[PDB]
Amino acid sequence: GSHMSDNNATDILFVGGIDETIDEKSLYDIFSSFGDIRNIEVPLNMTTKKNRGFAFVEYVEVDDAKHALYNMNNFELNGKRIHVNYSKT
């Protein structure tokens, strides 16, 4: 156990705190294995590829949303730990 995720997240998924060799297209295909994707907002800088603690991710279907974020607390991305929670739209 690391961090318990209990929220009402329908169609809205926050992933912030990702490692500095991923880009836009890579966060599409690693989550598309259960769920294909609507729209992606991930700012990235051309000197270090820093994301500054924050990125937004919208899914296609509303059941699949819930089963992915509850599995995503204990999952590490390229040896870095991602904080995963519900957002505003």
From TrEMBL:
<feature type="binding site">
    <location>
        <position position="58"/>
    </location>
    <ligand>
        <name>Mg(2+)</name>
    </ligand>
</feature>
<dbReference type="GO" id="GO:0006457">
    <property type="term" value="P:protein folding"/>
</dbReference>
<dbReference type="GO" id="GO:0003755">
    <property type="term" value="F:peptidyl-prolyl cis-trans isomerase activity"/>
</dbReference>
<dbReference type="GO" id="GO:0003723">
    <property type="term" value="F:RNA binding"/>
</dbReference>
<keyword id="KW-0694">RNA-binding</keyword>
<keyword id="KW-0479">Metal-binding</keyword>
<dbReference type="GO" id="GO:0046872">
    <property type="term" value="F:metal ion binding"/>
</dbReference>
<protein>
    <submittedName>
        <fullName>RNA-binding protein, putative</fullName>
    </submittedName>
</protein>
<feature type="binding site">
    <location>
        <position position="11"/>
    </location>
    <ligand>
        <name>Mg(2+)</name>
    </ligand>
</feature>
<feature type="domain" description="RRM">
    <location>
        <begin position="11"/>
        <end position="89"/>
    </location>
</feature>
